[PDB]
Amino acid sequence: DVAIVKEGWLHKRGEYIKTWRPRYFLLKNDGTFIGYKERPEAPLNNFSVAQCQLMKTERPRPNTFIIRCLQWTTVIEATFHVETPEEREEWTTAIQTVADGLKKQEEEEMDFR
């Protein structure tokens, strides 16, 4: 029963270039977070938000949020900008709710085996 939770345009900072480009992202309730060059082609970005930490910053762009994940030895970061703080709150709340549901599932599978 995997379904889209939230979708929309985000300004994503490149991990390589560090410039900002618009990407159309869809978040699903299983943690899938997929980003396209055009509103729906293979996606340009594809990663799970399970076990992510969300951070907010105002520099260099206001209304920035960062999704940070620790996987083996690597830190994955994804940096996004939206035009208003309200939109940032909408995205970070949606991502956090999905991540929290996945964490509950993880606890039910891993605790007291």
Numbering used by the authors: 3 to 42, 49 to 121
Sentences from the paper on this structure:
Here, we discover unexpectedly that a single mutation R86A Akt exhibits intensified autoinhibitory features with enhanced PH domain-kinase domain affinity. Despite the NMR HSQC analysis suggesting the possibility of structural perturbations induced by R86A mutation, the X-ray structure of the R86A PH domain revealed very high concordance between the WT and R86A PH domain structures, with an overall RMSD of 0.198 for main chain atoms. The structure of the R86A mutant was determined in the same crystal lattice as the WT protein, and their main chain conformations are essentially identical. In fact, apart from the mutated Arg86 residue, only the side chains of Glu17 and Tyr18 showed significant structural changes in the R86A X-ray structure. By contrast, in the R86A PH domain, the Glu17 side chain rotates away from Ala86 and the side chain of Lys14, and this rearrangement appears to induce an alternate side chain rotamer for Tyr18. Paradoxically, breaking the Arg86-Glu17 hydrogen bond by R86A mutation sharply increases PH domain stability and promotes a Tyr18 rotamer which enhances the binding of the PH domain to the kinase domain. Differential scanning fluorimetry revealed that R86A has increased melting temperature (51±1°C) compared to WT PH domain (42±1°C). This supports our hypothesis that the R86A PH domain is preorganized in a rigid, stable, conformation suited for tight inhibitory interaction with the kinase domain.
The Ser/Thr protein kinase Akt1 (termed Akt in the present work) and its paralogs Akt2 and Akt3 serve as key effectors in the PI3-kinase/Akt signaling pathway to regulate cell survival, proliferation, and metabolism by phosphorylating a variety of protein substrates. Akt is a 480 amino acid protein comprised of an N-terminal pleckstrin homology (PH) domain, a central kinase domain, and a regulatory C-tail. Regulation of Akt’s activity involves an autoinhibitory intramolecular interaction between its pleckstrin homology (PH) domain and its kinase domain that can be relieved by C-tail phosphorylation.
